[PDB]
């Protein structure tokens, strides 16, 4: 004691929403390295709009401990220009610029390259689904107007009648508004961020007005969530699992949470504790970890008080265009072990750790090969819907000034209940213009 000397410790920075899974990933990865070094996971805040704050504070403050960061899927176009998140092209081993594109899906990979040069390696991806209680509702809506109709129908019968959407002033609201706008045939910025294309075309104005009208029609309806304007991912997932809601729109990571939290107690409408076949089926640290058939038991049991369905469209004719999201792994510029970091990155994302994160953390893997395995398809039932939704997904503007634009958007849509479509649509344009020109001061 007194002087605990050890090898290098590559510091890994992942959001807290999925800390306990990337911790086990790091544990599995600290075996294929022997004694060369070790990886240590460190948690970032749970909200996307402040994960960037922490990362940028550490990067600009020359924090020499920041080694590997799992950054959001919309920040590359900014961290690359700002000098941070050094490009894949200069790994002293010369392996990342081709390990990244080996088996990655074609969608998420397009979010890393900024000027055709890659600056990060995709580690996971996301897309929202529709989760419902099949015992209460039947034939899930598959349309937003149908969603609200079913909500009113359940409220008339004195039932859980919340819709459980993400509506805070964060990025989860801009994501939803972007999904609606693009699925209605619109877009915030031009193909290249140069001038706001929100409300210049009459068709574009109609699209943004329809999106705003859907946003306002939700959150102002009988039996709605009272604190709807303070909800995000965790809050929506929890408010659904309690039994307060019968519908929700949330990322796929809610299925593993459902199963694990039901086995650990919690969920009242699915006991799963009085089944001695599930005894000892909780790891000593909390995770679920079924054996091989405990999963079948606890999944066939939940298959009748839980279910999912593709994202609800806007008009009943055309399908939806769900906004893509995920995490990319990048190596910070304030790193002295700029080789071990690039080694640990490619050792973090491989055909076993991807399988592990997707089968015990809900996070959709990005290795395009995994979605063709039978067993993985049998322990990840929403794989087909995820693959389908990822095909025609609607990406975000991807400009260097994006995160300064999403703040303006979320600020002018901050209270959803206090929305009126015609003025708010014309008001979004001025704020988007200011964000493009970087004028004024953000809230």
């Amino acid at each position: 004691c007194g002087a605990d000397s050890q090898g290098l410790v590559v510091s890994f920075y992942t959001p807290a929403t999925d800390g306990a899974t990337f911790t086990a990933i790091a544990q599995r990865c600290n075996q294929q390295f022997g004694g060369r070094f070790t990886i240590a996971q460190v948690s970032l805040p749970r909200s996307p709009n402040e994960q960037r704050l922490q990362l940028a504070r550490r990067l600009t403050g020359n924090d020499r401990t920041l080694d590997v960061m799992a950054l959001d899927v919309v920040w590359t176009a900014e961290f690359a220009e700002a000098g941070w998140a050094l490009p894949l092209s200069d790994d002293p081993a010369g392996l990342a610029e081709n390990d990244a594109v080996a088996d990655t899906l074609p969608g998420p990979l397009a979010t890393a390259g900024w000027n055709h040069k890659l600056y990060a390696a995709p580690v996971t991806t996301n897309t929202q689904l529709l989760w419902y209680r099949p015992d209460l509702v039947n034939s899930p809506p598959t349309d937003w107007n149908a969603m609200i109709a079913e909500a009113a129908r359940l409220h008339a019968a004195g039932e859980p009648s919340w819709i459980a959407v993400q509506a805070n002033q964060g990025e989860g609201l801009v994501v939803w508004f972007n999904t609606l706008l693009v699925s209605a045939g619109g877009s915030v910025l031009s193909e290249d961020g140069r001038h706001v294309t929100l409300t210049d075309t009459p068709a574009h104005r109609a699209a943004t007005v329809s999106a705003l009208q859907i946003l306002k029609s939700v959150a102002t309806t009988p039996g709605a969530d009272p604190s709807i304007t303070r909800t995000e991912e965790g809050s929506a997932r929890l408010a659904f699992e309690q039994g307060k809601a019968a519908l929700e729109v949330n990322w796929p990571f809610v299925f593993a949470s459902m199963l694990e939290n039901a086995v650990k107690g919690g969920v009242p409408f699915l006991p799963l504790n009085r089944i001695p076949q599930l005894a000892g089926s909780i790891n000593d640290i909390g995770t679920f970890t079924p054996s091989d058939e405990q999963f079948r038991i606890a999944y066939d049991a939940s298959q009748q008080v839980f279910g999912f369905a593709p994202y609800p469209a806007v008009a009943p004719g055309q399908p939806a265009k769900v906004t893509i999201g995920g995490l990319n792994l990048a190596v910070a510029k304030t790193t002295r072990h700029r080789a071990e970091a690039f080694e640990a990155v490619r050792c973090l994302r491989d055909q076993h750790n991807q399988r592990y994160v997707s089968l015990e953390g809900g996070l959709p893997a990005v290795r395009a090969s995994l979605y063709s395995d039978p067993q993985f398809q049998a322990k990840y039932p929403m794989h087909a819907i995820i693959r389908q939704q990822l095909t025609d997904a609607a990406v975000r503007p991807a400009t260097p000034v994006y995160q300064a634009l999403s703040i303006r958007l979320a600020a002018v849509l901050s209270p959803i209940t206090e929305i009126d479509p015609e003025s708010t649509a014309d008001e979004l344009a001025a704020q988007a213009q200011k964000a493009i020109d970087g004028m004024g001061l953000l809230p």
Partner: protein, 271 residues
């Protein structure tokens, strides 16, 4: 005996309730099992120490309590040392500009901490002490040293200075007087100003939140501000409550131990 007794009893139980309700509330939250934690029961039912178990399993709060305590001590030591050598000079000497000095020592104490974080960040990112103990001790003196000067200047003016001439009249060596008669008359003032400055060190969040990055320099209020719960899928209310209780009990028992000195110090001389 009859009226006044019950009068004061029912009057001063109200303040006990006032002070203890926002604490008993969170403490009861901290014991509710993760299932029943969502009902508005003020009194729990079938309490479980599982939240505290999950808090103790881990190392996030030890390595932050230690940082807070160490930074507090290293700050208050130099604060008291550099503040006594001024308070003694402000309560006994008449240099030109005394009222200005005491006014400054009064005002800068409640400095707007937001006016500092921009230049301090822009300086410490470029000198090298971004996430370090000195990088925090250096801004903290802006609030420690004025408070120490104020407190010790208030206390020193209550010293029977005539004892100086007394010792000069029955002894010798004004240095020996300064060493043997006023130093025992000035030790408790230092012992109390130390407690005051130390307690005052804890209530900062903006600077410790915007100038610290990792486990090497994160304090307690920053550690609890970024906490989210032991597990990643369970309801975080009970876990956050237990973490808060655990992170706040030490300074609470410290204040309870030193209550007498604290009330004698803040109320300068009185009580």
């Amino acid at each position: 005996g009859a009226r006044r007794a019950t009068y004061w009893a029912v009057l001063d139980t109200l303040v006990v309730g006032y002070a203890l309700l926002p604490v008993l509330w969170i403490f009861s939250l901290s014991l509710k099992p993760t299932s029943t934690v969502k009902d508005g029961k003020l009194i729990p039912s079938t309490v479980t120490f599982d939240n505290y178990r999950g808090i103790f399993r881990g190392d996030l709060f030890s390595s932050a309590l230690i940082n807070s305590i160490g930074i507090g001590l290293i700050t208050t030591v130099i604060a008291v040392v550099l503040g006594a050598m001024a308070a003694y000079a402000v309560a006994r000497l008449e240099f030109p500009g005394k009222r200005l000095l005491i006014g400054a020592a009064l005002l800068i104490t409640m400095f707007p901490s937001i006016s500092l974080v921009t230049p301090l960040f822009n300086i410490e990112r470029a000198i090298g002490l971004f996430d370090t103990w000195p990088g925090l001790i250096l801004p903290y003196i802006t609030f420690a040293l004025p408070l120490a000067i104020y407190t010790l200047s208030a206390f020193f003016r209550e010293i029977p200075w005539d004892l100086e001439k007394a010792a000069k009249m029955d002894g010798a060596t004004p240095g020996q007087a300064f060493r043997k008669v006023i130093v025992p008359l000035a030790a408790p003032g230092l012992v109390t100003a130390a407690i005051l400055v130390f307690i005052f060190a804890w209530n900062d969040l903006l600077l410790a939140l915007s100038l610290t990055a990792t486990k090497a320099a994160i304090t307690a209020p920053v550690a609890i501000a970024n906490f989210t719960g032991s597990s990643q899928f369970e309801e975080p209310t009970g876990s956050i409550a237990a973490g808060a209780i655990v992170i706040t009990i030490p300074i609470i028992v410290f204040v309870l131990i030193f209550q007498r000195r604290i009330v004698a110090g803040l109320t300068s001389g009185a009580v």
